[PDB]
Amino acid sequence: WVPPEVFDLVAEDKARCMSEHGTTQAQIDDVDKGNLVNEPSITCYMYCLLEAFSLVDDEANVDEDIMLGLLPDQLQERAQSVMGKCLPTSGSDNCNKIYNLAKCVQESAPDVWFVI
Amino acid sequence: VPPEVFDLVAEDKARCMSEHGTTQAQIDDVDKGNLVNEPSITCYMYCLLEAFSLVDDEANVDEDIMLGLLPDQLQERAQSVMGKCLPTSGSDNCNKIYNLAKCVQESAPDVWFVI
Ligand SMILES: CC(=O)CCCCC/C=C/C(=O)O
Ligand SMILES: CC(=O)CCCCC/C=C/C(=O)O
Ligand SMILES: CC(=O)CCCCC/C=C/C(=O)O
Ligand SMILES: [Cl-]
Ligand SMILES: [Cl-]
Ligand SMILES: [Cl-]
Ligand SMILES: [Cl-]
Ligand SMILES: [Mg+2]
Numbered sequence: 584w585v586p587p588e589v590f591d592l593v594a595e596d597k598a599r600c601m602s603e604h605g606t607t608q609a610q611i612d613d614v615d616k617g618n619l620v621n622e623p624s625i626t627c628y629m630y631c632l633l634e635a636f637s638l639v640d641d642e643a644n645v646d647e648d649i650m651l652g653l654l655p656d657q658l659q660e661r662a663q664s665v666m667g668k669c670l671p672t673s674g675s676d677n678c679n680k681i682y683n684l685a686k687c688v689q690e691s692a693p694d695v696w697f698v699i
Numbered sequence: 700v701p702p703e704v705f706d707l708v709a710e711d712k713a714r715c716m717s718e719h720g721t722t723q724a725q726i727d728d729v730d731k732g733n734l735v736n737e738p739s740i741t742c743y744m745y746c747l748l749e750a751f752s753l754v755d756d757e758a759n760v761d762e763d764i765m766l767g768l769l770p771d772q773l774q775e776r777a778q779s780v781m782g783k784c785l786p787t788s789g790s791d792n793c794n795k796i797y798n799l800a801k802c803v804q805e806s807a808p809d810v811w812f813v814i
Contacts, residue, residue, distance in 0.1 A: 587732045587804070587811035592768055593708055599770055617702045636751065637767040649752045649764070655710040689702070696702040 592635075593699060600631035617696040619685055626678035629685065632699045643672050643680040658695065665691045708814060715746035732811040734800050741793040744800060747814060758787050758795035769812075780806045 601611060606628040614625060633639045637649050647666050654662050669687035674680035689696070716726065721743040729740060748754045753765050762781060769777050784802035789795035804811065 585808065587809060589730065589732060589811045589813060592812055592814055595770075615704065617704065635768065637764045646752075652750050652752050653707045653711060655705060655707075655714065658705070694700065694702050695705070697705040697707050699707055 596632060596635040596699070600628050600635070604628045604631060615698050617689065619682065619689075621679060621682050623678050626682040626685075630678050630681045633681065636699065639681065641677075643674075643677045645670055645672055645684065661692060661695070711747060711750045712814075715743050715750065718746060719743045729800075730813050732804055734797065734804060736794065736797045738793045741797040741800075745792045745796040748796060751814065754787075754792075754796070756792075758789075758792040758799075760785055760787060760799070768814075776807065 597611070600606070601608075604627040605624045607624075610625050611628070613619070614629060619625060619629075630639060630643075633645075634641065636653070637646060638653075639645050645666075647670060650666070651659065651662060665688055668691055669684055672680035672684050674683040712726065715721070716723075719739055719742045721739055725740040726743065728735075729744065735741075745754065745758060748758075749756075751764070752761060753768075754760050760781075762785065765781070766774060766777055780803055783806045784799055787795040787799050789798045
């Protein structure tokens with residue numbers, strides 16, 4: 584046995600997603616605080632992070648069951664009502680659909696946000 | 700009032716470790732690629748994969764979800780590893796995941812991916 588090089592999937596996904604969508608760290612910091620803008624460098628970044636855990640496919644379809652598994656116990660009941668209101672996604676393109684979803688979630692549950 | 704921000708991965712690990720009596724030291728060892736066939740840690744590993752929909756209630760791997768964790772450039776290597784290591788086998792869910800982790804480690808020994 585030789586020590587392997589270890590890769591944190593979350594870290595590697597954020598590095599890749601930020602590079603593939605031209606996202607700045609300031610932008611990521613804003614997103615991590617729940618502050619969003621309808622600009623692809625933000626919204627396609629969010630999309631990219633969701634897709635890397637199979638929370639969305641490549642056609643903006645969100646997998647509710649995968650999402651529920653990730654959420655903590657204390658948010659399960661609320662999450663079911665919020666996703667019932669906010670899914671299926673709708674918008675102008677893949678990334679705007681994810682924008683609209685995020686905004687729908689914030690409207691329904693203004694005290695809840697997450698970072699992957 | 701700013702929203703409370705939940706760290707999903709941190710929550711999932713916290714929940715699994717509390718369910719299985721798993722210590723941070725155990726999780727840190729696995730994160731370094733050190734594996735042992737001990738339920739307190741192997742059941743944690745199963746729990747975490749299950750939370751991510753990577754495995755079902757019998758520790759069967761969902762191949763599309765597992766491959767979906769990885770970037771495009773790693774799909775071929777990942778598929779090769781899955782050819783060697785799936786389907787899972789073992790005496791219970793925790794042992795199935797232990798055998799899977801060990802297979803994955805042996806099959807791609809230069810690298811170790813962790814949620
Ligand atoms: C429907 C639901 O509960 C959560 C989906 C909201 C989108 C959140 C995106 C988060 C991120 O990209 O960090
Ligand atoms: C259970 C788990 O953490 C999944 C690890 C990610 C997929 C396995 C990687 C294969 C490869 O990249 O060598
Ligand atoms: C069997 C396999 O492919 C991966 C084993 C589980 C690794 C999951 C990492 C968990 C953590 O980092 O806490
Ligand atoms: Cl983009
Ligand atoms: Cl959807
Ligand atoms: Cl479209
Ligand atoms: Cl399997
Ligand atoms: Mg994919």
